[PDB]
Design a protein around this nucleic acid. Structure first.
Ligand SMILES: [Mg+2]
Ligand SMILES: [Mg+2]
Ligand SMILES: [Mg+2]
Ligand SMILES: [Mg+2]
Ligand SMILES: [Mg+2]
Ligand SMILES: [Mg+2]
Ligand SMILES: [Zn+2]
Lengths: 229, 119, 56, 115, 122
RNA sequence: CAAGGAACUCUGCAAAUUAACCCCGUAAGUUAGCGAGAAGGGGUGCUUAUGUAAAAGUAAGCCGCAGUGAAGAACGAGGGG
RNA sequence: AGCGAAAUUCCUAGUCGGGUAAAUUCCGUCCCGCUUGAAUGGUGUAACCAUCUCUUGACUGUCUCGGCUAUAGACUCGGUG
RNA sequence: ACCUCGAUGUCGACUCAUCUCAUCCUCGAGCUGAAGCAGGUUCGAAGGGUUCGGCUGUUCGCCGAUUAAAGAGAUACGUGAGUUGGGUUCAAACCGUCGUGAGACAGGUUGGUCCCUAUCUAUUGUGCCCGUAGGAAGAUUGAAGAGUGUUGCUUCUAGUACGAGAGGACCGAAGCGAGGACACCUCUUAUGCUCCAGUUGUAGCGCCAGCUGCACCGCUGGGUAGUAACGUGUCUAUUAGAUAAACGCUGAAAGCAUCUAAGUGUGAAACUAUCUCAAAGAUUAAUCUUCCCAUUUCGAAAGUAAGAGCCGUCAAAGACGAUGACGUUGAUAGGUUACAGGUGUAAGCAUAGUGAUAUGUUGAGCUGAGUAAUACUAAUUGCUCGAGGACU
């Protein structure tokens, strides 16, 4: 479908209190207005996509071909450029803000680069188990179990492709789906998203229309205080 | 291997920092490994900036770090500091010491550096 | 765990192909003529235009 | 551009309560609670002593400990929460910001009043 | 977080002073019974003039937990002991009186007889 | 290391509890010697006063979550070969 | 005589009772004891055992269920090898 | 008795599983001595799941409580250069039995050494070089792929259909869960060795006070940032195509009949997609955009002015490489300042008390990483690689 998307950063995580009197955890996303830079039309190049440019920066802090592209296209220089598949209803050079794309409490999903953790063990990676600690189970007892598949020339004589062992973990794009929007703040270029947002604070976060539930909305109001003394 | 050296425990680390900052106060320059000067500099700067008041409480706090040296014992080192070193730095906001790099040693190729302080 | 066949003189060279060295950045110190390695002090006693040491 | 991480504080600035009476770890309070089953929201009092005052804003929390029929119960709360009101009845003297040592004493263990 | 084989106090007048867990119910490998979840137990210590003798197997509903559990509205209730009540296969306790406070999350699951007989619900 | 406390396992293996001094209190059994430090509990900090030869001891008061505040100190019960 | 599914019992994981929610292990009892049995001793026996075996209190990362921290390695750089 | 006796380490248990279908559940369907509920048998189906305990070395089994289910097998009866050693299978000893005797018993009982630093390949990752017909910086398409797919309970539909009567639905809707997975640290906890406070002994700082060294971080109560779960969010759908079993419409072959031969359908957690991730070394080296270059004269040799590397300050990254940010035209690190958070009323002084000590100064003092400002210090007034697109 005609996917809606927008880019921002992650500045922390907090909570807010809503009607029905439940504590809702909140991630706060500083979403500076993006700027379309290319409209990939179905006719021109065999698919429909739109390219966003965000994280505006000074002209000097930019490579020469990139700055030349920006000057020739008559846009504002930005550090990052990315495109979203199946985004149609926008034209070149039009500024976009998250309030122009979303309701106050409808359904969106979020994809962002995860938090790196370096080379890690198998158990901490694949959620394996740990050999016994009593009765003297020997020293190599934090390992991925037996990788044996078959002993003898007939059976396997190898270790199968796509095994589960230790390796680099994290710092990879991940996606959490069906995270409700909670509120906007046009004054500070700010949006509110329920749930937990992947990635370390200060990174780059992407927001898209949820694929599982495109237009579904279950609105949530606030719980403005009534305590005075 | 089961038995081993005590190694670089937190107490050893902080005591080395104490010794090096005391030596810097005594003389004004040290030829030590770069990745030790880069740590000593923090306590050096904190002690220098703390000693710009000369109240008894600040001298008590300084007592927690200094160690006597061949040139100056601890009390004489305190008098030296609070009488001539701190007055020299009464208007420089932070950054009282510099850490420049030497060439590697022939023994270990470690990168010696000079922890030095001046205006 | 021991080698079953002799590792030949070809595999050893292939492995040691990456064991080569590289030169460190070199610069000419000012106020005095020598080739110190960059971002360090020369034996001349000058780091740029500043006093950090004795003569040598 | 650049940020402040006070954007957080700015976004809690909407739902932060007004009065938020000042109480330390060693106080006893009464927290009125609103319960809505269907209608006619009943107010349930829950009086006891405070065990902690942790938090940094809307995440401010406290612990209130109570005893009924000899069974000691404690309930954590969020200050800046509707359906919750707080007042002071007695102010007590104590030297610790998180008095965990009140979990393992029976009666005749009461924090002394603070003039 | 009362788990498999968890001796725990009893909070009614059935005379079942000390009872241990024998299985947590509701699914395979439940391994945890929070407030409200029905468990089966086995009385391991009673009073001489009790309606339940030692060694019987019975189902019970937990009321008080030491670990506690986060509530939806933000509060986090937590008791200091593990208790239960001895139900009889639909909703009703095998006893007549209930000792100590009882959690509120038993309201939705049913068990309204317990809340009626409860001295003070929290 | 929260909750649980042998569910681990071939077995409470290993690890965990108690631990010094002083004071109450100690069963079955027995070859009447033992059992037995059985079991199970209480106190120790500081100050003043009173202590006597010194000190234990005693009274009053004070502080901390905690008072052989660390370091060194027995975990038991029951039955059988 | 005594003792007796025993360090001995193949059928046998014998019957029954006790212990547990559940007990091829344990305790008591029964006796067709293949082939128990009296100085290669038979039956009991208080104390003792870095002896074997079962139940239990306290106790605990043994375990449900893994997590964190510090060192010395591991890894990177120089030297020997 | 065919390979191995100039050694192929053999039971069970733990860890990790993978595969087959002769299917345990979930899924579809036919028949019935199938009223309904519940069943029995058979056909299709391997996507996913298939419990925890007592006894035994145990597989196996019996039992107890469960769940939708507690499948049948294979992989040197999977798996010791992954663990264990309870058993078998060393010397010791004892019981019964046999042997006149040394001794023996798939008869039993107690104790009893389990080595290896990874060369090749396979796999997990992460790099250097070169290549893709000029060089470089970005943005993409996606051939070939990988990952996930479990299910229950309650309420309503409805005590309706069915049934005499107990009983009691198909189809669907909603809510709440268990397990597993992916993230996150606002909440709850765990940990949190240059944090705060209390406190013992000892040796010092010439003594009081106050600090330091050591005693498991000496011990104890908390605790920043960070890392996590026991914590909180999401997922575990939905939809489309083509099909298995099966049911068909029409229709002859064979004037009837007939699901099939033509034609035309309905049709399952299986298959191809929808979902997530990676991906042009996809040499079949794809596409797009932007920037840089056309000289020095007999194939060279100047070889950029696009860019990149060496070196430096670092971390959202991290074993080392790399990745990402920044190198004076600078907020990258440190320092300084302000603040947050944590700890909890500092020292000194005054008052009261004979004294431990109490009150006032004081929500004070202190602070590893946290938030933010500020060139004070450190990232130098450096070296190297790198262009004329070759032919159709
Ligand atoms: Mg060994
Ligand atoms: Mg060979
Ligand atoms: Mg090499
Ligand atoms: Mg004898
Ligand atoms: Mg051989
Ligand atoms: Mg081994
Ligand atoms: Zn020079």
């Amino acid at each position: 479908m005609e996917i809606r998307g927008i880019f921002g950063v992650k500045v922390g995580m907090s909570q807010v209190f809503t009607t029905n009197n439940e504590r809702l955890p909140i991630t706060v996303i500083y979403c500076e207005p993006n700027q379309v830079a290319g409209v990939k039309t179905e006719a021109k190049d065999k698919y429909s996509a739109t390219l966003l440019s965000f994280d505006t920066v000074e002209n000097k802090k930019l490579n020469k071909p990139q700055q030349g592209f920006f000057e020739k296209n008559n846009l504002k220089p930005t550090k990052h450029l990315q495109e979203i598949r199946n985004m149609t209803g926008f034209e070149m050079g039009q500024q976009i803000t998250p309030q122009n794309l979303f309701q106050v409490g409808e359904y969106v999903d979020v994809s962002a680069i995860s938090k790196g953790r370096g080379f890690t063990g198998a158990i901490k990676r694949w959620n394996f188990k740990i050999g016994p600690l009593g009765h003297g189970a020997g020293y190599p007892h934090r390992f991925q179990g037996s990788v044996q598949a078959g002993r003898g020339g007939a059976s396997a004589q190898r270790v199968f492709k796509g095994k589960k062992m230790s390796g680099h973990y994290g710092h990879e794009k991940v996606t959490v789906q069906n995270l409700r929007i909670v509120g906007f703040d046009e004054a500070n270029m700010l949006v509110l998203v329920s749930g937990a947002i992947a990635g370390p604070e200060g990174g780059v976060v992407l927001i898209r229309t949820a694929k599982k539930k495109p237009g579904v909305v279950k609105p949530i109001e606030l719980a403005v205080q009534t305590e005075k003394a | 291997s089961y038995i081993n050296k005590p190694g670089k425990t937190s107490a050893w680390r902080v005591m080395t920092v104490r010794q090096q900052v005391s030596a810097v106060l005594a003389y004004g320059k040290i030829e030590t490994t770069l990745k030790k000067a880069k740590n000593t500099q923090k306590r050096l700067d904190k002690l220098i900036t703390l000693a710009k008041v000369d109240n008894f409480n600040n001298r008590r706090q300084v007592k927690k770090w200094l160690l006597n040296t061949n040139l100056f014992d601890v009390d004489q080192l305190m008098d030296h500091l609070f009488s001539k070193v701190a007055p020299k730095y009464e208007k420089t906001p932070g950054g009282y010491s510099r850490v420049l790099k030497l060439g590697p040693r022939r023994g270990d190729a470690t990168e010696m550096a000079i922890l030095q302080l001046t205006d | 765990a021991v080698q079953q066949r002799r590792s030949s003189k070809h595999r050893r060279d292939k492995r040691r192909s990456h064991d080569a060295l590289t030169a460190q950045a070199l610069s000419v110190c000012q106020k005095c003529g020598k080739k110190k390695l960059f971002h360090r002090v020369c034996s001349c006693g000058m780091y740029g235009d500043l006093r950090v040491k004795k003569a040598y | 551009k650049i940020n402040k991480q006070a954007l957080i504080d700015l976004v809690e600035q909407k739902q932060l309560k007004a009065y938020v009476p000042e109480f330390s770890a060693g106080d006893e309070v009464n927290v009125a609670i609103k319960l809505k089953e269907k209608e006619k929201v009943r107010i349930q009092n829950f009086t006891g002593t405070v065990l902690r005052r942790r938090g940094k804003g809307i995440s401010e929390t406290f612990i209130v400990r109570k005893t009924t029929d000899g069974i000691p119960i404690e309930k954590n709360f969020q200050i800046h929460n509707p359906n919750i009101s707080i007042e002071l009845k007695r102010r007590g003297k104590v030297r610790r910001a998180y008095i965990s040592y009140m979990r393992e004493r029976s009666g005749k263990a009461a924090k002394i009043k603070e003039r | 977080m009362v788990s498999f084989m968890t001796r725990l106090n009893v909070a009614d007048n059935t005379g079942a002073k000390q009872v241990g867990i024998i299985k947590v119910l509701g699914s395979t490998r439940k391994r945890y019974a929070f407030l409200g979840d029905v468990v089966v137990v086995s009385v391991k210590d009673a009073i001489p003039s009790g309606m339940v003798k030692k060694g019987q197997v019975l189902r019970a509903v937990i009321v008080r937990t030491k670990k506690g559990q986060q509530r939806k509205d933000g509060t986090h209730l937590k008791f200091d002991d593990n208790a239960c009540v001895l139900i009889k296969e639909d909703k009703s306790p095998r006893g007549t009186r209930i000792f100590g406070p009882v959690a509120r999350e038993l309201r939705e699951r049913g068990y309204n007889k317990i809340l009626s007989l409860a001295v003070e619900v929290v």
